[PDB]
């Protein structure tokens, strides 16, 4: 039994864990580890938005261009591509790139080939929407939790190794306790999403300024290796409730502090689906997310199922990563996207 | 004319500059430039404190040990060594190291050679004080201003080049306007310096937790190369008033939000003085520092002299660097130092 907080990130606490030192969790779970060299990661979501069959091939070709850009020097270490249809009826292709070094990310982003493409007036006449939602949490500002040990997805893939079994899980509040910064910091939101260039209502190029301690969750499901048994457990017994939860956040999240809820399925560059999905959730604060996860019947129903089946699990892969970031480490930019896209929906015009 | 804010760090402003776009400064001044690869610097002040002639040789040797540690793998790019006698009558040797990569800094800090020496029980029995005051401002969170273009000292030494003449200087508020983060952030202090291990009153090992937006100023004077004329201008006409302002901050700074004011002179490892000095000032916020600089007769007197003599200066080198940093990027640690040392003085015991 180990703490989820890596030894180099342990600090004298000025805030207490939810559970006492004697706490033992109910079943094994693991976290991603990295040594002191991992200072900050960059999580970059790049999207292509389109409407209808009419624009499907153009969208895939734009996304091929973006993914190809990841192969340029200082591109991300790892990436994956997803699709979802939003509540406005628009299709959205999203690729996430992970960097383990923010200087490399910035070299890539500022490079002529990348920046000339993104800043070109030509992006405005292509009948597609494009967007960038980028955050750079420090090592202190994220946590991961896996129900398995090998082949860690998402941010875990850019870290060094897997921990042994960790103490801080199996109770509400445990996510927070796994963030090293929770030792001393409440992670409170300040200020608001703010429109700082363009107009969300009118398309074109729009820049949304972020705010400190926006929480971002990627919670994922990978059933690609499951046999008939675990495949059925997932698709028949977990997914229908999860879908209800994701629809709920998508359609009713605004008053709860859920700025954007996407429920996405991995695809390849031909647009064929893979048996892997995840939520991408942007929240005003970690506390808002905590409230929903611990009280909504959808999440509570699947939480119970997990506790019940966790011991049997062989191939079904369930995990999450959650992070917070500083305003100074966030980018939210949109080109010809509809007004409910991502952080456009809740951005404040004149705070 | 150029902006002080480097092109990659310009943002849509939500806070306005103090002067309008048409403003032209009264005389030329320059800043340090670095490209997008410079993400964050680390400024590490490492000290050895002693009292009396009886501890002098032991203190110089302790500092030789510390300076020799900078040659270890992932040591600082640059460093310099200073002496001052504090108001408590203790002598203080301080070496500053600058890193341009925080991962390198952290590899060095956590290395067995460095960390075993710092954490050893042996440190407590040596009749000397040791301290570390380390901060890591992002590129957005510091500014430099030089009255010259070549051989930039301090943090400038780890940056890439010197700018052309810059717009944002010559008025109160210009320091603030030179910080890229001032485009959107008031840089307000939150919370307080807090004792989180040990007891400042009782020596031994003491850890002080920082707070967001502590301001750190290094304002320097180098007359080493001045011929007759500039040597007299400095030592006869500037220094006596500067000394009065430094004594004021040292002895009367607490109510003003100056946590620590040190006026130090460079030395070699033998303790021979060099003709270079600087202030090392730690302030609750940039605003507190602004108020003092723009209103105190000492600083105002030398400000005026500078305006008068700036056109003539050839060899006398005057400059500053000012930074703010996040609580999560600060270290304030003390071993057997007296209770008025650095951040021990104003640290709150039970906030
Ligand atoms: C297959 C789908 C899911 C299942 C079976 C599931 C189940 C669970 C379980 C069992 C835990 C506690 C883990 C532990 O500490 O050992 C947990 C934590 C959590 N889940 Fe889910 N979950 C799923 C999807 C999601 C999604 C899509 C969200 C998005 C909001 C979410 C939000 C959370 C949060 C915020 C926590 C941390 C609670 C805390 O520690 O305070 N979950 N989930
Ligand atoms: C020989 C010593 C010094 C001289 C001749 C001097 C003079 C000046 C001058 C002329 C400026 C305005 C520069 C410009 O914007 O063009 C300035 C700015 C400033 N100085 Fe000094 N100074 C000296 C030392 C110090 C020291 C030791 C401190 C430490 C507190 C200090 C604090 C400041 C601050 C905070 C500003 C920025 C004011 C603002 O832009 O709002 N100075 N100084």
| Distance (Å, whole) CA A37 – CA A293 | 33
**C-beta neighbour count of B124 within 10 angstroms:** 13
Structure tokens at B320: 């500053």
Residues ≥6 apart with Cβ < 8 Å to A322: A142, A143, A144, A175, A179, A215, A216, A217, A218, A286, A289
Evaluated on CA atoms B334, B193, B46, A12, the torsion sign reads positive
**C-beta neighbour count of B332 within 10 angstroms:** 26
| Distance (Å, whole) CA B143 – CA B226 | 26
Residues ≥6 apart with Cβ < 8 Å to A130: A46, A47, A48, A49, A62, A118, A123, A334, A335, A336, A337
Using an 8 Å CB-CB cutoff, list residues of chain A that contact chain B: 8, 11-12, 14, 36-40, 101-103, 106-107, 109-110, 138, 140, 181, 184-185, 194, 196-197, 207, 209, 326-328
Q: Which residues of B are annotated as a binding site for heme b?
A: 299
3-state secondary structure of B303: helix
Structure tokens at B176: 């603030």
Pairing of strands A273-283, A258-267: antiparallel
Please answer whether residues B165 and B33 qualify as being in contact, where contact means their C-beta atoms are separated by less than 8 angstroms: no
**What residues flank ligand 1, with Cβ below 6 Å?**
A 29, 169-170, 172-175, 217, 219, 221, 238, 242, 279, 281, 289-290, 293-294, 299, 302-303, 305-306, 318
All residues of chain B having their beta carbon less than 8 Å from the beta carbon of residue A14 are 194, 196, 209
Structure tokens at B213: 């937006």
Residues ≥6 apart with Cβ < 8 Å to B133: B44, B45, B47, B282, B331, B332, B342, B343
Strands (E) in A126-225, as ranges, are 129-135, 142-146, 161-162, 194-197, 205-209, 214-222
Residues ≥6 apart with Cβ < 8 Å to B106: A8, A36, A37, A39
CA–CA distance from A87 to each of A36, A91, A263, A266 (Å)? 42, 10, 11, 19
Pairing of strands A205-209, A214-222: unpaired
Burial of B126 (0-12, 13-18, 19+ CB in 10 A): middle
Please tell me what resolution, in angstroms, this structure has. 1.8
Of B14, B106, B194, the CB nearest to A37: B106
Of B11, B103, B197, the CB nearest to A37: B103
**Per annotation, catalytic residue among B79, B211, B296, B320:** B320
Centroid of ligand 2 to alpha carbon of B249 (angstroms): 14
| Distance (Å, whole) CA B328 – CA A34 | 18
Closest CA to B87 of B130, B49, B47, B143: B49
CA–CA distance from A220 to each of A145, A229, A307, B259 (Å)? 11, 19, 17, 48
Evaluated on CA atoms B279, B284, B290, B293, the torsion sign reads negative
Burial state string for A237-250 with b = 16 or more CB within 10 A and e = fewer than 16: ebbebbeebbebbb
Give the mutation target among B243, B319, B320, B324 for probing the ligand 2 site: most ligand atoms within 8 A of CB: B320
Residues ≥6 apart with Cβ < 8 Å to A215: A187, A281, A282, A283, A284, A285, A286, A288, A289, A322, A323, A324
| Distance (Å, whole) CA A324 – CA A326 | 7
Method: X-ray
Please answer whether residues B12 and B21 qualify as being in contact, where contact means their C-beta atoms are separated by less than 8 angstroms: no
Q: Could you give the angle at which helices B297-309 and B239-252 cross, rounded to 10 degrees?
A: 150
All residues of chain A having their beta carbon less than 8 Å from the beta carbon of residue B38 are 103
Closest residue (by CA) to atom 14 of ligand 1? A170
**Ligand 2 contacts CB of residue B28 (under 6 A):** no
Q: In DSSP terms, which residues pair with B161 in a beta bridge?
A: B33
Asked if A110 lies within 8 A of B36 by C-beta distance, the reply is yes
Strands (E) in A88-140, as ranges, are 91-99, 129-135
What single-letter DSSP state applies at residue B254? G
Centroid of ligand 2 to alpha carbon of B266 (angstroms): 20
Spacing of C-alpha B126 from chain mean position: 28
Structure tokens at A39: 């200072």
Structure tokens at A100: 């383990």
All residues of chain B having their beta carbon less than 8 Å from the beta carbon of residue A196 are 11-12, 14
Closest residue in B to A349 (Cα) is B14
Closest residue in B to A11 (Cα) is B196
- Ramachandran sector of residue B42 (left: φ over 0; alpha: ψ -120 to 50; beta: rest): beta
| Distance (Å, whole) CA A154 – CA A277 | 11
Q: In DSSP terms, which residues pair with A131 in a beta bridge?
A: A47, A334
What single-letter DSSP state applies at residue A124? G
Closest residue (by CA) to atom 9 of ligand 2? B303
To probe the interface with B, which of A10, A12, A35 has the most B CB atoms within 10 Å?
A12
């Amino acid at each position: 039994m180990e703490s989820a907080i890596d030894t180099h990130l342990k600090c004298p606490r000025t805030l207490s864990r939810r559970v006492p030192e004697e706490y033992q969790p109910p079943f094994p779970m693991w976290v991603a580890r990295a040594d002191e060299q991992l200072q900050q990661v960059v999580m970059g979501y790049l999207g292509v938005q389109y409407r209808g069959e009419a624009q499907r091939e153009a969208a895939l070709q734009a996304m091929r261009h973006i993914v190809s850009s990841f192969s340029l020097p200082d591109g991300p270490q790892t990436h994956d591509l997803t699709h979802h249809t939003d509540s406005s009826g628009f299709d959205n292709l999203m690729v996430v790139g992970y960097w383990k070094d923010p200087a490399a990310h910035c070299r890539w982003l500022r490079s002529a080939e990348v920046n000339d493409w993104w800043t070109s007036q030509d992006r405005l006449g292509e009948g597609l929407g494009y967007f960038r939602e980028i955050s750079a949490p420090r090592a202190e500002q994220f946590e991961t939790l896996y129900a398995f040990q090998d082949n860690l997805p998402g941010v875990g893939a850019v870290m060094d190794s897997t921990s042994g079994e960790i103490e801080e899980h199996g109770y509400w509040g445990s996510m927070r306790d796994r963030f090293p910064i929770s030792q001393t910091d409440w992670m409170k939101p300040t200020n608001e999403l703010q429109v700082v260039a363009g107009d969300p209502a009118k398309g074109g190029r729009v820049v949304i300024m972020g705010h400190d301690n926006i929480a971002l969750i990627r919670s994922g499901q990978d059933w690609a290796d499951a046999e008939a048994e675990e495949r059925s457990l997932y698709l028949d017994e977990i997914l229908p409730t999860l879908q209800d939860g994701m629809d709920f956040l998508r359609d009713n999240g605004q008053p709860l502090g859920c700025y954007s809820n996407r429920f996405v399925r991995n695809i390849d560059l031909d647009g064929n689906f893979l048996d892997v999905s995840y939520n991408i959730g942007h929240w005003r604060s970690l506390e808002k997310l905590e409230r929903w996860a611990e009280s909504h019947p959808t999440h509570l129903r699947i939480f119970v199922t997990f506790f019940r089946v966790a011991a049997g699990l062989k191939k079904l892969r369930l995990y999450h990563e959650v992070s917070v970031s500083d305003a100074k480490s966030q980018v939210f930019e949109y080109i010809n996207c509809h007004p409910h896209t991502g952080m456009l929906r809740d951005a404040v015009v004149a705070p």
